[PDB]
Amino acid sequence: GSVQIVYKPVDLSKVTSKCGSLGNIHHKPGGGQMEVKSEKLDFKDRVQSKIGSLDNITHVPGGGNKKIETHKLTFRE
C-alpha cells in the first residue's frame, strides 16, 4: 500500500506597478481632545485592541504592491 505525493506547483506570476510623479499630498488633521477611562480589562489569546487612541497616518509608497503565498502539505498515516 504505497503512497506517492508529488507537490510541484509553478508560479511565474508578476505583480507590477508603473507610476509617473507621485506627490502634492497634504494631510492636515484637526487636533483632538480625548478622555479614556478603562476599569477592568481582561484580554487573552491573540487580541488586538485600540481604545481612545488617535492615529494620524500619511503612507505614500512608490509601489506598495504585495504578494502573499502559503503552501501547506499535511500527512496523517
PDB file of C-alpha atoms in Angstrom:
ATOM      1  CA  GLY A   1       0.000   0.000   0.000  1.00  0.00           C
ATOM      2  CA  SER A   2       2.340   2.710  -1.328  1.00  0.00           C
ATOM      3  CA  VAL A   3       1.744   6.483  -1.284  1.00  0.00           C
ATOM      4  CA  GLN A   4       3.195   8.882  -3.880  1.00  0.00           C
ATOM      5  CA  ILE A   5       2.611  12.640  -3.400  1.00  0.00           C
ATOM      6  CA  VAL A   6       4.319  14.904  -5.961  1.00  0.00           C
ATOM      7  CA  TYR A   7       3.753  18.545  -4.905  1.00  0.00           C
ATOM      8  CA  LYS A   8       5.153  20.581  -7.820  1.00  0.00           C
ATOM      9  CA  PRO A   9       3.423  23.998  -8.172  1.00  0.00           C
ATOM     10  CA  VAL A  10       4.870  26.583 -10.577  1.00  0.00           C
ATOM     11  CA  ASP A  11       4.470  30.356 -10.073  1.00  0.00           C
ATOM     12  CA  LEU A  12       5.731  32.587 -12.889  1.00  0.00           C
ATOM     13  CA  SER A  13       3.422  35.409 -11.772  1.00  0.00           C
ATOM     14  CA  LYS A  14       4.188  39.141 -11.753  1.00  0.00           C
ATOM     15  CA  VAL A  15       2.680  41.934  -9.637  1.00  0.00           C
ATOM     16  CA  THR A  16       3.800  45.169 -11.303  1.00  0.00           C
ATOM     17  CA  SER A  17       3.149  48.903 -10.993  1.00  0.00           C
ATOM     18  CA  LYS A  18       4.219  51.915 -13.006  1.00  0.00           C
ATOM     19  CA  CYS A  19       3.550  55.483 -11.993  1.00  0.00           C
ATOM     20  CA  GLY A  20       4.640  58.998 -13.013  1.00  0.00           C
ATOM     21  CA  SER A  21       5.315  61.646 -10.360  1.00  0.00           C
ATOM     22  CA  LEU A  22       3.645  60.932  -7.019  1.00  0.00           C
ATOM     23  CA  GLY A  23       3.167  63.998  -4.887  1.00  0.00           C
ATOM     24  CA  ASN A  24       1.467  67.200  -3.792  1.00  0.00           C
ATOM     25  CA  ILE A  25      -0.236  65.340  -0.931  1.00  0.00           C
ATOM     26  CA  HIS A  26      -1.496  67.284   2.134  1.00  0.00           C
ATOM     27  CA  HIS A  27      -2.802  65.621   5.307  1.00  0.00           C
ATOM     28  CA  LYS A  28      -3.883  68.191   7.879  1.00  0.00           C
ATOM     29  CA  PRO A  29      -5.883  66.548  10.675  1.00  0.00           C
ATOM     30  CA  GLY A  30      -7.640  68.825  13.143  1.00  0.00           C
ATOM     31  CA  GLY A  31      -6.487  68.374  16.759  1.00  0.00           C
ATOM     32  CA  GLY A  32      -8.069  66.040  19.267  1.00  0.00           C
ATOM     33  CA  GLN A  33      -9.365  66.119  22.804  1.00  0.00           C
ATOM     34  CA  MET A  34      -9.566  62.639  24.246  1.00  0.00           C
ATOM     35  CA  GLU A  35     -10.578  61.261  27.665  1.00  0.00           C
ATOM     36  CA  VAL A  36     -10.255  57.456  28.257  1.00  0.00           C
ATOM     37  CA  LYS A  37     -11.260  55.718  31.465  1.00  0.00           C
ATOM     38  CA  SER A  38     -10.822  51.918  31.466  1.00  0.00           C
ATOM     39  CA  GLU A  39     -11.577  49.958  34.664  1.00  0.00           C
ATOM     40  CA  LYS A  40     -11.363  46.133  34.285  1.00  0.00           C
ATOM     41  CA  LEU A  41      -9.918  44.798  31.032  1.00  0.00           C
ATOM     42  CA  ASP A  42      -9.091  41.106  30.515  1.00  0.00           C
ATOM     43  CA  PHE A  43      -7.568  40.211  27.137  1.00  0.00           C
ATOM     44  CA  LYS A  44      -6.051  36.824  26.215  1.00  0.00           C
ATOM     45  CA  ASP A  45      -5.181  34.645  23.192  1.00  0.00           C
ATOM     46  CA  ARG A  46      -4.380  36.917  20.220  1.00  0.00           C
ATOM     47  CA  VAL A  47      -6.452  40.003  20.996  1.00  0.00           C
ATOM     48  CA  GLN A  48      -5.767  43.198  19.035  1.00  0.00           C
ATOM     49  CA  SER A  49      -7.426  46.275  20.579  1.00  0.00           C
ATOM     50  CA  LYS A  50      -7.491  50.058  20.359  1.00  0.00           C
ATOM     51  CA  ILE A  51      -9.249  52.243  22.888  1.00  0.00           C
ATOM     52  CA  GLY A  52      -9.284  56.059  22.889  1.00  0.00           C
ATOM     53  CA  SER A  53      -6.342  56.090  20.515  1.00  0.00           C
ATOM     54  CA  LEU A  54      -5.751  58.720  17.830  1.00  0.00           C
ATOM     55  CA  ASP A  55      -3.596  57.731  14.862  1.00  0.00           C
ATOM     56  CA  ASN A  56      -2.720  60.163  12.063  1.00  0.00           C
ATOM     57  CA  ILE A  57      -1.016  58.309   9.169  1.00  0.00           C
ATOM     58  CA  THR A  58       0.343  59.511   5.825  1.00  0.00           C
ATOM     59  CA  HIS A  59       1.557  56.447   3.877  1.00  0.00           C
ATOM     60  CA  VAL A  60       2.826  57.127   0.335  1.00  0.00           C
ATOM     61  CA  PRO A  61       4.733  54.137  -1.129  1.00  0.00           C
ATOM     62  CA  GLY A  62       6.175  54.440  -4.614  1.00  0.00           C
ATOM     63  CA  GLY A  63       4.928  50.877  -5.220  1.00  0.00           C
ATOM     64  CA  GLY A  64       3.131  49.374  -2.241  1.00  0.00           C
ATOM     65  CA  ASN A  65       2.413  46.113  -4.130  1.00  0.00           C
ATOM     66  CA  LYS A  66       2.122  42.883  -2.147  1.00  0.00           C
ATOM     67  CA  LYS A  67       2.217  39.181  -2.973  1.00  0.00           C
ATOM     68  CA  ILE A  68       1.205  36.668  -0.275  1.00  0.00           C
ATOM     69  CA  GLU A  69       1.652  32.942  -0.835  1.00  0.00           C
ATOM     70  CA  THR A  70       1.095  29.987   1.519  1.00  0.00           C
ATOM     71  CA  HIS A  71       1.914  26.375   0.655  1.00  0.00           C
ATOM     72  CA  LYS A  72       0.842  23.674   3.098  1.00  0.00           C
ATOM     73  CA  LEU A  73       1.082  19.874   2.989  1.00  0.00           C
ATOM     74  CA  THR A  74      -0.312  17.762   5.831  1.00  0.00           C
ATOM     75  CA  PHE A  75       0.095  13.970   6.025  1.00  0.00           C
ATOM     76  CA  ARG A  76      -1.539  11.691   8.629  1.00  0.00           C
ATOM     77  CA  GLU A  77      -0.963   7.917   8.390  1.00  0.00           C
TER      78      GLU A  77
END
